[PDB]
């Protein structure tokens, strides 16, 4: 308010200027006596350019939603307007292609693991969800484009699903049976390349395509990236806290259809609940065959085999790490032994002056003394460390023999079992 | 004040400081204006130079710095450059300027924008023609080439601006305005039309490309009195936000009516009264609704041109059940101003 | 400088530039002040106008622009408006102002804040009453209505400010300050009390609601000499940050001691010495600790009113083992100043 | 303009406003300069004071505010302080200054940077010695203590700057420049050397520590004519960005050639032509490439000292297949200027 005061409309001007001239306004006189001050002095000026130059010249030197990689479960804190997700166009990394190809030829492979203890540190209310996205064509046998608009549930070859295993909830890629997920169209929004999918039973999933920035993988203390990508049996209750859907874009957008799963972060009570129900369902499924031994054993021996396999893998890991530790400590030793040979050559060098107290060399002699005794202590330390590493390495070498005998026994058990 | 008026060039540094506060019931979320300290200082410079007897060139710039902000990350919040332009005044044909300046439609909407603090809500900034924007080329005629006294007209072209937000973006536009002042009476009519950018269409609300505004203004100012009445209609031009949906956009149709009546006294006093109303129509999912509907009752003591104090009490008639999360609460503001 | 003095109105544009640098061992993380280039320029305007013989109105504003920043995204970092307020001075009863200004307790703390660059650390900014804050209304009496010469008092109300960070927030507050100057000697006492907002209480450190500051100052200034000693105590008012915990908050109790002794010479020279200390008590989990503990030794050559150079060496006595990650390193600063 | 010249002290407020626009094919991503409205206003203050007959002290500061930005969160984008320094001029021995100022190499590169809007592309800002930077201490001699007229030399030390970006960061540096002006003819030579910070070395592009720049300039200005030719070579000094890779760093080697020919008329006219070229060598993965290669054809009409208009058409010869995603499009700019 108050803007109207004054504020003339039409053209804008206030009053008469002091002088006429655009660039030549002063008082008077020209023809100069050179005096600098008299009535015949022209300039009538002083302190012309006492200050220094300040950058002479014009001086106009020049002129006046990071996307989450496909297949990498990440936390999205919700808003009132729903979840925020931004996909990319760049095709899914080697990792996920690998996993899904392996899996093509209920079991599954664990992408990530969840830890409420940590997830709450940043999201105390436990409102955050876990979003994951894949390019529809890698999941669906029939491209989503070439699909009736009437279909609400498209068939899928794999899905991203929450499971409860080893006392943690974890997000993982499942497959191997008839599966099928909601198909929903993506209304656009103000932002350019940004739509709103609404999956039944999830929040508003507002997506945003972005193929300008190079894709990123977000890293959150709760969500881990389980290196072990072995195929394991999957939950009977898999998905009990997951909502996924194939989302298609409008024809005049040019955006490929994308699959997205959105899983809840379970609290630890809910995780004990899921584990319990899972154990009850495993109990159920166990028998009902001809007898308990026929099937229960089938299962205990296949699980035991898969575990022995994990044991072998971790043992091999330990042995490849112990081989490097061994070689490293060995070369540290070698190095320190060359340094020792050096210092002891310098002592042979200046030995002459050992009993010559008034020579230059007889300084460098004690100095080489110091050098040698140090390098020797060093060598001793490298020897201790190398011995220790050789011990660890031998232990590992036996660990492998034992673990792979165990794998052989568990694989024979798992054969006998699978025959019965 | 004029600090340098030499060499056929004159510079008028004009700046002011305003210790301001807003009061209202509650925290102030629903208050018309807000609540708390709104102190701010503005600085600007105007300059003229008569290149020729019949041709002179002028340049004006203004910036606003807010003092209510803290010294942390929010120091720059609310700090901006309002006006920055230049131009030349020929003897009679008129004058032509370019830069960042008020839109022609603001010329019409100036009559109502006489309130001490509130007022001119419809004249949003960075909007098509109602408020001050950057990238305008304007030609103006005074007294129709000196033919008819008091009747002046202006035309304005608006270069497209592609910004991040539809609220601040625009496209190619055109507009015109005419104002006849006779014997104290004043009449004005302004019209502006432009095309909405693709980003603008992307808004959930709003439909169509031609964003159109136009307005008509009447007034009488003299004898320490000032009456004014501006009626303006627009299509797909006015911004609107929905707190319930937390979604924004533009109004398919809008009618706005503003009325002001202010008296001034010899002893530096100016009581003021203002009625206001704005109704948007054909809103997507909200039908027709009223954006603003309130009375003003306020006053201003003018100690002198350079010192003044003022108060304004806004009786917000908006209801709480309004379908756009608009603030349905009254408000008041008290301000003191120094200006050179 | 006075640029406009006409029509019973006077405008004084005051601005300066400071080429500054900070040195210290290492990168400067542990240095008291810091390290590197700290060049900055400040601009401001003061204005007065005698409305009546007994009544005059004044408005003052100041801004600080930093030159150390680059021309990229960090250009605006550290740029802010220090002071922006207005007010009126009656003949004898006193004067009343409002805006963004120093808190009454700063009046007491002015005696110690005479150092060239460092000093007045206790008078933090955006703190309740010790430093310059926004939303204060102050009334001042000079010579107790002209009754007793040299004895003047001020009172200040502080409107609540709900900001994003507890560091910059406050609540309803009140305060007062009195200063008696006699024969060169000077005495002052200031007290301020306010309520902490929920964000402040929610902070891990600090406990209680009444955020309280108060200070007492004594001095003797004459014959080119200036001695000063300010002792101030506060509750839940001083800000504190823990690098080890990377957590901030307020101090349940704090005592601060400041001592200054500066001499001036006819030949534009002014050596200075300053002692300082601040001890916080009842810290949550840290008991009692020292926030700052250092000596000053510096000097200043005054070429004239408009040109000066200066140097300051800060002997930080704080130890590295302090339980708040405080800088246990010495520091030095060298500055040159032009000012109009 | 000189606003205050009293008490042996003089203040010159200098500021201007520029209504500017850039045209080019397409949205302007690939345009040399850009496209749209580029209006901006600069404000600055210079101040001097003769402390003694043989010793005077000066301080200067400049800021640039852009008007193209909107009034939302992006208001401050492109707003910065160009120059902010101070210093003293002794009678004959010379002068010493410190602050944020042009690097010595700018002295050599000034000859080519005479264009109305474009020009001086090689003289990047916040670069080692070619452009204006903060933390420099410069000494200058005029006419070699008055021994040889027209021959003046300068030396400059550059304090290290560890910023967030390698583009804006630097380290300890030194430089010198010599300029002999005789009877209108002019010759200059400048050299600068500094060390790159870890962030700069850590950049994917660029390799080595010694960032080196140097330049040689020749000119003749008289009879309303201005000819100039500057050749400068640098190592690990020029910044470079790859749109294809969206990765930046510095250029292992760079050669830059600038040529200018401008004529001036009595009736406030000055047509201009400029050739320019810059080729980087030993680029990581791109071998040798041309960063900029264009012609200039432009003009400027000077209505008076305070008012001017100008146009510049840049014939960008860079090809689309350039291996750095550089803009291979022409461009043009049209500007109007008021300045006091």
PDB file of N, CA and C in Angstrom, chain C residues 231-299:
ATOM      1  N   UNK C 231      31.211  -6.611  32.987  1.00  0.00           N
ATOM      2  CA  UNK C 231      30.930  -7.923  33.553  1.00  0.00           C
ATOM      3  C   UNK C 231      29.457  -8.229  33.332  1.00  0.00           C
ATOM      4  N   UNK C 232      29.175  -9.315  32.627  1.00  0.00           N
ATOM      5  CA  UNK C 232      27.800  -9.686  32.321  1.00  0.00           C
ATOM      6  C   UNK C 232      27.490 -11.138  32.609  1.00  0.00           C
ATOM      7  N   UNK C 233      26.290 -11.375  33.130  1.00  0.00           N
ATOM      8  CA  UNK C 233      25.827 -12.718  33.444  1.00  0.00           C
ATOM      9  C   UNK C 233      24.493 -12.955  32.758  1.00  0.00           C
ATOM     10  N   UNK C 234      24.297 -14.187  32.291  1.00  0.00           N
ATOM     11  CA  UNK C 234      23.097 -14.551  31.551  1.00  0.00           C
ATOM     12  C   UNK C 234      22.678 -15.973  31.903  1.00  0.00           C
ATOM     13  N   UNK C 235      21.399 -16.255  31.667  1.00  0.00           N
ATOM     14  CA  UNK C 235      20.823 -17.578  31.839  1.00  0.00           C
ATOM     15  C   UNK C 235      20.127 -17.951  30.538  1.00  0.00           C
ATOM     16  N   UNK C 236      20.403 -19.160  30.035  1.00  0.00           N
ATOM     17  CA  UNK C 236      19.735 -19.694  28.842  1.00  0.00           C
ATOM     18  C   UNK C 236      19.673 -18.664  27.714  1.00  0.00           C
ATOM     19  N   UNK C 237      20.758 -17.913  27.534  1.00  0.00           N
ATOM     20  CA  UNK C 237      20.758 -16.834  26.551  1.00  0.00           C
ATOM     21  C   UNK C 237      21.913 -16.928  25.560  1.00  0.00           C
ATOM     22  N   UNK C 238      23.058 -17.410  26.010  1.00  0.00           N
ATOM     23  CA  UNK C 238      24.215 -17.399  25.128  1.00  0.00           C
ATOM     24  C   UNK C 238      24.226 -18.647  24.254  1.00  0.00           C
ATOM     25  N   UNK C 239      24.517 -18.516  22.962  1.00  0.00           N
ATOM     26  CA  UNK C 239      24.553 -19.696  22.099  1.00  0.00           C
ATOM     27  C   UNK C 239      25.847 -20.471  22.253  1.00  0.00           C
ATOM     28  N   UNK C 240      25.740 -21.780  22.062  1.00  0.00           N
ATOM     29  CA  UNK C 240      26.877 -22.675  22.222  1.00  0.00           C
ATOM     30  C   UNK C 240      26.755 -23.811  21.224  1.00  0.00           C
ATOM     31  N   UNK C 241      27.894 -24.215  20.668  1.00  0.00           N
ATOM     32  CA  UNK C 241      27.960 -25.279  19.679  1.00  0.00           C
ATOM     33  C   UNK C 241      29.046 -26.269  20.074  1.00  0.00           C
ATOM     34  N   UNK C 242      28.762 -27.558  19.890  1.00  0.00           N
ATOM     35  CA  UNK C 242      29.675 -28.644  20.229  1.00  0.00           C
ATOM     36  C   UNK C 242      30.066 -29.372  18.954  1.00  0.00           C
ATOM     37  N   UNK C 243      31.323 -29.187  18.542  1.00  0.00           N
ATOM     38  CA  UNK C 243      31.838 -29.871  17.362  1.00  0.00           C
ATOM     39  C   UNK C 243      31.877 -31.376  17.584  1.00  0.00           C
ATOM     40  N   UNK C 244      32.247 -31.805  18.793  1.00  0.00           N
ATOM     41  CA  UNK C 244      32.323 -33.235  19.061  1.00  0.00           C
ATOM     42  C   UNK C 244      30.955 -33.863  18.865  1.00  0.00           C
ATOM     43  N   UNK C 245      29.923 -33.205  19.375  1.00  0.00           N
ATOM     44  CA  UNK C 245      28.560 -33.676  19.239  1.00  0.00           C
ATOM     45  C   UNK C 245      27.883 -33.070  18.026  1.00  0.00           C
ATOM     46  N   UNK C 246      28.455 -32.003  17.473  1.00  0.00           N
ATOM     47  CA  UNK C 246      27.849 -31.305  16.349  1.00  0.00           C
ATOM     48  C   UNK C 246      26.424 -30.902  16.706  1.00  0.00           C
ATOM     49  N   UNK C 247      26.253 -30.430  17.938  1.00  0.00           N
ATOM     50  CA  UNK C 247      24.943 -30.045  18.448  1.00  0.00           C
ATOM     51  C   UNK C 247      25.041 -28.670  19.079  1.00  0.00           C
ATOM     52  N   UNK C 248      23.981 -27.887  18.958  1.00  0.00           N
ATOM     53  CA  UNK C 248      24.010 -26.534  19.488  1.00  0.00           C
ATOM     54  C   UNK C 248      22.894 -26.345  20.506  1.00  0.00           C
ATOM     55  N   UNK C 249      22.839 -25.140  21.049  1.00  0.00           N
ATOM     56  CA  UNK C 249      21.802 -24.783  22.005  1.00  0.00           C
ATOM     57  C   UNK C 249      22.217 -23.551  22.789  1.00  0.00           C
ATOM     58  N   UNK C 250      21.676 -23.437  23.998  1.00  0.00           N
ATOM     59  CA  UNK C 250      21.948 -22.287  24.844  1.00  0.00           C
ATOM     60  C   UNK C 250      22.565 -22.735  26.159  1.00  0.00           C
ATOM     61  N   UNK C 251      23.134 -21.761  26.862  1.00  0.00           N
ATOM     62  CA  UNK C 251      23.857 -21.991  28.103  1.00  0.00           C
ATOM     63  C   UNK C 251      22.937 -21.738  29.290  1.00  0.00           C
ATOM     64  N   UNK C 252      22.793 -22.740  30.160  1.00  0.00           N
ATOM     65  CA  UNK C 252      21.990 -22.541  31.358  1.00  0.00           C
ATOM     66  C   UNK C 252      22.508 -21.359  32.164  1.00  0.00           C
ATOM     67  N   UNK C 253      23.825 -21.199  32.257  1.00  0.00           N
ATOM     68  CA  UNK C 253      24.354 -20.034  32.948  1.00  0.00           C
ATOM     69  C   UNK C 253      25.648 -19.619  32.275  1.00  0.00           C
ATOM     70  N   UNK C 254      25.925 -18.317  32.288  1.00  0.00           N
ATOM     71  CA  UNK C 254      27.152 -17.818  31.689  1.00  0.00           C
ATOM     72  C   UNK C 254      27.597 -16.562  32.406  1.00  0.00           C
ATOM     73  N   UNK C 255      28.891 -16.493  32.680  1.00  0.00           N
ATOM     74  CA  UNK C 255      29.533 -15.276  33.141  1.00  0.00           C
ATOM     75  C   UNK C 255      30.586 -14.870  32.126  1.00  0.00           C
ATOM     76  N   UNK C 256      30.633 -13.582  31.833  1.00  0.00           N
ATOM     77  CA  UNK C 256      31.528 -13.025  30.837  1.00  0.00           C
ATOM     78  C   UNK C 256      32.201 -11.810  31.442  1.00  0.00           C
ATOM     79  N   UNK C 257      33.496 -11.686  31.179  1.00  0.00           N
ATOM     80  CA  UNK C 257      34.302 -10.600  31.702  1.00  0.00           C
ATOM     81  C   UNK C 257      35.102 -10.014  30.552  1.00  0.00           C
ATOM     82  N   UNK C 258      35.026  -8.697  30.400  1.00  0.00           N
ATOM     83  CA  UNK C 258      35.701  -7.982  29.333  1.00  0.00           C
ATOM     84  C   UNK C 258      36.412  -6.776  29.924  1.00  0.00           C
ATOM     85  N   UNK C 259      37.635  -6.534  29.461  1.00  0.00           N
ATOM     86  CA  UNK C 259      38.463  -5.439  29.946  1.00  0.00           C
ATOM     87  C   UNK C 259      39.202  -4.863  28.753  1.00  0.00           C
ATOM     88  N   UNK C 260      39.225  -3.541  28.651  1.00  0.00           N
ATOM     89  CA  UNK C 260      39.847  -2.859  27.526  1.00  0.00           C
ATOM     90  C   UNK C 260      40.629  -1.663  28.042  1.00  0.00           C
ATOM     91  N   UNK C 261      41.778  -1.415  27.417  1.00  0.00           N
ATOM     92  CA  UNK C 261      42.618  -0.261  27.726  1.00  0.00           C
ATOM     93  C   UNK C 261      43.252   0.187  26.418  1.00  0.00           C
ATOM     94  N   UNK C 262      42.854   1.353  25.926  1.00  0.00           N
ATOM     95  CA  UNK C 262      43.354   1.870  24.663  1.00  0.00           C
ATOM     96  C   UNK C 262      43.897   3.275  24.854  1.00  0.00           C
ATOM     97  N   UNK C 263      45.060   3.539  24.270  1.00  0.00           N
ATOM     98  CA  UNK C 263      45.636   4.873  24.241  1.00  0.00           C
ATOM     99  C   UNK C 263      45.646   5.403  22.817  1.00  0.00           C
ATOM    100  N   UNK C 264      45.570   6.726  22.692  1.00  0.00           N
ATOM    101  CA  UNK C 264      45.560   7.400  21.401  1.00  0.00           C
ATOM    102  C   UNK C 264      46.655   8.453  21.401  1.00  0.00           C
ATOM    103  N   UNK C 265      47.286   8.642  20.247  1.00  0.00           N
ATOM    104  CA  UNK C 265      48.346   9.625  20.096  1.00  0.00           C
ATOM    105  C   UNK C 265      47.932  10.718  19.127  1.00  0.00           C
ATOM    106  N   UNK C 266      48.595  11.867  19.256  1.00  0.00           N
ATOM    107  CA  UNK C 266      48.306  12.979  18.362  1.00  0.00           C
ATOM    108  C   UNK C 266      48.623  12.614  16.921  1.00  0.00           C
ATOM    109  N   UNK C 267      49.658  11.807  16.707  1.00  0.00           N
ATOM    110  CA  UNK C 267      50.102  11.471  15.357  1.00  0.00           C
ATOM    111  C   UNK C 267      49.388  10.211  14.867  1.00  0.00           C
ATOM    112  N   UNK C 268      48.064  10.274  14.904  1.00  0.00           N
ATOM    113  CA  UNK C 268      47.252   9.228  14.321  1.00  0.00           C
ATOM    114  C   UNK C 268      47.634   7.822  14.735  1.00  0.00           C
ATOM    115  N   UNK C 269      47.835   7.579  16.029  1.00  0.00           N
ATOM    116  CA  UNK C 269      48.145   6.245  16.524  1.00  0.00           C
ATOM    117  C   UNK C 269      47.275   5.938  17.734  1.00  0.00           C
ATOM    118  N   UNK C 270      46.898   4.668  17.877  1.00  0.00           N
ATOM    119  CA  UNK C 270      46.030   4.248  18.977  1.00  0.00           C
ATOM    120  C   UNK C 270      46.312   2.800  19.356  1.00  0.00           C
ATOM    121  N   UNK C 271      47.276   2.565  20.241  1.00  0.00           N
ATOM    122  CA  UNK C 271      47.493   1.204  20.751  1.00  0.00           C
ATOM    123  C   UNK C 271      46.364   0.742  21.662  1.00  0.00           C
ATOM    124  N   UNK C 272      46.092  -0.563  21.627  1.00  0.00           N
ATOM    125  CA  UNK C 272      44.983  -1.133  22.379  1.00  0.00           C
ATOM    126  C   UNK C 272      45.386  -2.457  23.016  1.00  0.00           C
ATOM    127  N   UNK C 273      44.757  -2.756  24.154  1.00  0.00           N
ATOM    128  CA  UNK C 273      44.923  -4.013  24.877  1.00  0.00           C
ATOM    129  C   UNK C 273      43.547  -4.443  25.370  1.00  0.00           C
ATOM    130  N   UNK C 274      43.268  -5.744  25.322  1.00  0.00           N
ATOM    131  CA  UNK C 274      41.967  -6.240  25.760  1.00  0.00           C
ATOM    132  C   UNK C 274      42.091  -7.643  26.332  1.00  0.00           C
ATOM    133  N   UNK C 275      41.510  -7.838  27.511  1.00  0.00           N
ATOM    134  CA  UNK C 275      41.295  -9.158  28.084  1.00  0.00           C
ATOM    135  C   UNK C 275      39.826  -9.550  27.994  1.00  0.00           C
ATOM    136  N   UNK C 276      39.591 -10.856  27.876  1.00  0.00           N
ATOM    137  CA  UNK C 276      38.253 -11.389  27.687  1.00  0.00           C
ATOM    138  C   UNK C 276      38.178 -12.780  28.295  1.00  0.00           C
ATOM    139  N   UNK C 277      36.978 -13.156  28.730  1.00  0.00           N
ATOM    140  CA  UNK C 277      36.743 -14.501  29.240  1.00  0.00           C
ATOM    141  C   UNK C 277      35.246 -14.760  29.292  1.00  0.00           C
ATOM    142  N   UNK C 278      34.868 -16.012  29.041  1.00  0.00           N
ATOM    143  CA  UNK C 278      33.472 -16.417  29.153  1.00  0.00           C
ATOM    144  C   UNK C 278      33.423 -17.851  29.646  1.00  0.00           C
ATOM    145  N   UNK C 279      32.740 -18.072  30.762  1.00  0.00           N
ATOM    146  CA  UNK C 279      32.598 -19.395  31.349  1.00  0.00           C
ATOM    147  C   UNK C 279      31.122 -19.747  31.434  1.00  0.00           C
ATOM    148  N   UNK C 280      30.755 -20.877  30.837  1.00  0.00           N
ATOM    149  CA  UNK C 280      29.403 -21.398  30.909  1.00  0.00           C
ATOM    150  C   UNK C 280      29.330 -22.434  32.023  1.00  0.00           C
ATOM    151  N   UNK C 281      28.195 -22.452  32.711  1.00  0.00           N
ATOM    152  CA  UNK C 281      27.938 -23.359  33.815  1.00  0.00           C
ATOM    153  C   UNK C 281      26.595 -24.052  33.629  1.00  0.00           C
ATOM    154  N   UNK C 282      26.492 -25.211  34.285  1.00  0.00           N
ATOM    155  CA  UNK C 282      25.315 -26.071  34.216  1.00  0.00           C
ATOM    156  C   UNK C 282      25.051 -26.511  32.782  1.00  0.00           C
ATOM    157  N   UNK C 283      26.133 -26.783  32.050  1.00  0.00           N
ATOM    158  CA  UNK C 283      26.003 -27.321  30.705  1.00  0.00           C
ATOM    159  C   UNK C 283      25.506 -28.756  30.795  1.00  0.00           C
ATOM    160  N   UNK C 284      24.632 -29.139  29.871  1.00  0.00           N
ATOM    161  CA  UNK C 284      24.028 -30.468  29.916  1.00  0.00           C
ATOM    162  C   UNK C 284      25.084 -31.489  29.521  1.00  0.00           C
ATOM    163  N   UNK C 285      25.621 -32.193  30.512  1.00  0.00           N
ATOM    164  CA  UNK C 285      26.603 -33.225  30.271  1.00  0.00           C
ATOM    165  C   UNK C 285      28.039 -32.750  30.210  1.00  0.00           C
ATOM    166  N   UNK C 286      28.288 -31.441  30.302  1.00  0.00           N
ATOM    167  CA  UNK C 286      29.635 -30.895  30.226  1.00  0.00           C
ATOM    168  C   UNK C 286      29.978 -30.035  31.436  1.00  0.00           C
ATOM    169  N   UNK C 287      29.107 -29.990  32.438  1.00  0.00           N
ATOM    170  CA  UNK C 287      29.397 -29.184  33.612  1.00  0.00           C
ATOM    171  C   UNK C 287      29.708 -27.744  33.251  1.00  0.00           C
ATOM    172  N   UNK C 288      30.831 -27.248  33.763  1.00  0.00           N
ATOM    173  CA  UNK C 288      31.300 -25.892  33.512  1.00  0.00           C
ATOM    174  C   UNK C 288      32.501 -25.929  32.577  1.00  0.00           C
ATOM    175  N   UNK C 289      32.528 -25.002  31.619  1.00  0.00           N
ATOM    176  CA  UNK C 289      33.563 -24.964  30.592  1.00  0.00           C
ATOM    177  C   UNK C 289      33.757 -23.520  30.157  1.00  0.00           C
ATOM    178  N   UNK C 290      34.889 -23.245  29.514  1.00  0.00           N
ATOM    179  CA  UNK C 290      35.192 -21.908  29.020  1.00  0.00           C
ATOM    180  C   UNK C 290      34.954 -21.853  27.516  1.00  0.00           C
ATOM    181  N   UNK C 291      34.083 -20.931  27.090  1.00  0.00           N
ATOM    182  CA  UNK C 291      33.811 -20.748  25.666  1.00  0.00           C
ATOM    183  C   UNK C 291      34.918 -19.964  24.971  1.00  0.00           C
ATOM    184  N   UNK C 292      35.386 -18.882  25.585  1.00  0.00           N
ATOM    185  CA  UNK C 292      36.414 -18.024  25.007  1.00  0.00           C
ATOM    186  C   UNK C 292      37.299 -17.549  26.147  1.00  0.00           C
ATOM    187  N   UNK C 293      38.610 -17.549  25.918  1.00  0.00           N
ATOM    188  CA  UNK C 293      39.545 -17.121  26.954  1.00  0.00           C
ATOM    189  C   UNK C 293      40.812 -16.666  26.236  1.00  0.00           C
ATOM    190  N   UNK C 294      40.979 -15.350  26.110  1.00  0.00           N
ATOM    191  CA  UNK C 294      42.058 -14.814  25.296  1.00  0.00           C
ATOM    192  C   UNK C 294      42.441 -13.416  25.761  1.00  0.00           C
ATOM    193  N   UNK C 295      43.633 -13.001  25.337  1.00  0.00           N
ATOM    194  CA  UNK C 295      44.115 -11.633  25.442  1.00  0.00           C
ATOM    195  C   UNK C 295      44.082 -10.994  24.060  1.00  0.00           C
ATOM    196  N   UNK C 296      44.001  -9.669  24.027  1.00  0.00           N
ATOM    197  CA  UNK C 296      44.216  -8.916  22.801  1.00  0.00           C
ATOM    198  C   UNK C 296      45.444  -8.034  22.941  1.00  0.00           C
ATOM    199  N   UNK C 297      46.185  -7.879  21.845  1.00  0.00           N
ATOM    200  CA  UNK C 297      47.234  -6.869  21.747  1.00  0.00           C
ATOM    201  C   UNK C 297      47.219  -6.331  20.325  1.00  0.00           C
ATOM    202  N   UNK C 298      46.889  -5.055  20.163  1.00  0.00           N
ATOM    203  CA  UNK C 298      46.771  -4.513  18.828  1.00  0.00           C
ATOM    204  C   UNK C 298      47.043  -3.026  18.792  1.00  0.00           C
ATOM    205  N   UNK C 299      46.851  -2.453  17.608  1.00  0.00           N
ATOM    206  CA  UNK C 299      47.140  -1.044  17.391  1.00  0.00           C
ATOM    207  C   UNK C 299      46.375  -0.572  16.166  1.00  0.00           C
TER     208      UNK C 299
END
